[PDB]
Symmetry: C2
Subunit: 332 residues, 2 copies
């Protein structure tokens, strides 16, 4: 063990949609799945970044080979004045924060690979394939395909129409069986399934997470390096309506990040209201929240303790001289 059925469950739990189940099962009967996930390197990640990271951890725990693609070429093109280093210092900050996050979750990293787009997206073979793609991709499909995902400008750039085919070719050049992302990427993924065969390449399996509401919703966001006192204050302002299970950023963070750690979640609650309870199925926590026997305040306190456990080793790592230095440069 784990068996092919167990691997399939770990790979696909919590996803909104799977494209390519037939090929996914054929691969898992024989060998480990190869998957990539792309990240931008521009913003400053906050605790929402744990939602894709929780699936990356699942893939690693299932035995998959996981490549994380850092989009540095794209980052430079959306801010060409944005000085050289600063872009690659931010790539380096993202690489170090992802490693720390996965170490905190607690998964084996031997099969995790980090690649930068510029490592190969300017190579002659890849560029020739981009030209081939431009000679079969209609201008329509590229906008259609990119109908969301591409930031929407008034005088839109050519760059926008190139994005979908570059993402498709990354599947082939990273030599993976599958790409993971969000359901908001669905039209990019179906574009890749249509047009890779035109170039003689295989369509890939596509794994799509839901768009998970933010924890604070339901700067102002909890940064991965925020200290305990600010985690505490920001979570106490989090929206969390009593009995609301359908649209609740606190429950969503438990479903997608905290419950999966050990397939359980501890609610901290005063003895007066029943004392602590350990849930072994998310649906059971949902039922009690909908019944209003788990109060929002207690839900938030329960998330605060578990989240601070996840953040503690990351904050400690980033307070060493070498990473404290990097964080300041990447984000003056």
């Amino acid at each position: 063990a784990p068996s092919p059925e167990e691997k399939l469950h770990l790979i696909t739990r919590n996803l909104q949609e799977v494209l390519g189940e037939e090929k996914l099962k054929e691969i898992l009967k024989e060998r480990e799945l190869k998957i990539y996930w792309g990240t931008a390197t521009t913003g400053k990640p906050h605790v929402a970044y744990f939602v894709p990271m929780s699936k990356i951890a699942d893939f690693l725990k299932a035995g998959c080979e996981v490549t994380i693609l850092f989009a540095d070429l794209h980052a430079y093109l959306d801010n060409m004045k944005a000085p050289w280093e600063l872009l690659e210092l931010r790539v380096s900050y993202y690489e170090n924060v992802i490693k720390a996050m996965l170490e905190s979750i607690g998964v084996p990293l031997e099969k995790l690979k980090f690649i930068k787009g510029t490592d190969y997206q300017l190579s002659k073979e890849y560029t020739l394939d981009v030209y081939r793609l431009s000679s079969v991709v209609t201008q329509h499909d590229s906008k259609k395909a990119g109908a969301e995902v591409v930031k929407q400008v008034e005088h839109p750039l050519l760059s926008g129409l190139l994005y979908p085919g570059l993402q498709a070719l990354d599947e082939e050049y990273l030599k993976v069986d599958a790409q993971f992302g969000g359901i908001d990427q669905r039209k990019i993924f179906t574009f890749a399934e249509k047009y890779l065969p035109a170039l003689g390449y295989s369509k890939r399996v596509h794994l799509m997470n839901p768009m998970v509401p933010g924890l604070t919703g339901s700067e102002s966001k909890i940064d991965l390096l925020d200290r305990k006192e600010d985690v505490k204050k920001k979570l106490k302002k989090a929206f969390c309506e009593p009995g609301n299970v359908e649209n609740n950023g606190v429950l969503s963070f438990i479903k997608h990040v905290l419950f999966p750690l050990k397939s359980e979640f501890v609610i901290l609650r005063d003895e007066k209201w029943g004392g602590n309870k350990t849930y072994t199925a998310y649906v059971d926590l949902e039922k009690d929240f909908a019944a209003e026997v788990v109060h929002p305040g207690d839900l938030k306190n329960s998330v605060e303790v578990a989240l601070n456990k996840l953040l503690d080793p990351i904050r400690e790592k980033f307070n060493t001289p070498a990473l404290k230095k990097l964080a300041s440069a990447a984000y003056p």
Copy 2:
């Protein structure tokens, strides 16, 4: 000699339009002009190809450094099934026919350079600049810019929007001061003058020939290798209306190809109608044609003799075993 004024006259005679006269004169006060001209390598050239070749000959005679860019990458992308070799055999046919044409005109070739697009259009620096261009070129300007020139399809390809910026970057990567082409390329040329500075590169001088009506007008066309008997028959079917000087493919071929050889043209005419006459100014031939004292038949006979003089060494070169072989392969 020749002086800067003489070079300017040879470079710009017969053009429809010059963009960049100020920079052109500044360069010719100091050094030789560097110019490129691009050619496709797909069709089978016919005698109309002498119209751009006559300007290439002028540039060489003026002392310019001339680069001819063979668009082989573009040729492959518009026919990817179109087998490898066959595309490059056609590049080789075009290289050999241009050399023979210029040798027949009689110009020095020391400063003529042949480059294939694939020699550099897949290089990392060039590709990065293509991505930079895509991040400043609006999708509008590229279609606007490409409003003619790009073959017009119903479900148009992305490839079409890339063409104008690739042509612009060729100016920089070929390290020229100027690009020559047809007036039908004007919107591509003004695109290059707008967007090269965005990348930190200089705008170029642009030299534009008119769109010259075909000789036969005014397969069915005279191929550069057609034998004398077929030249004769095809020219006798050429349209050439008596007294018509404004739209006359026979007069246009004389203006753009034959008169420039020695800045004269001999009309062959029977003694009954005045005998032969040597014109030293095209306007003088135009006046006599408009006066109907040069008959269409005599105009055509005069072109037949001069054209067969131009074609004779080309036909002889292409009848050697090595070039006869190449012609058949390039065009089964």
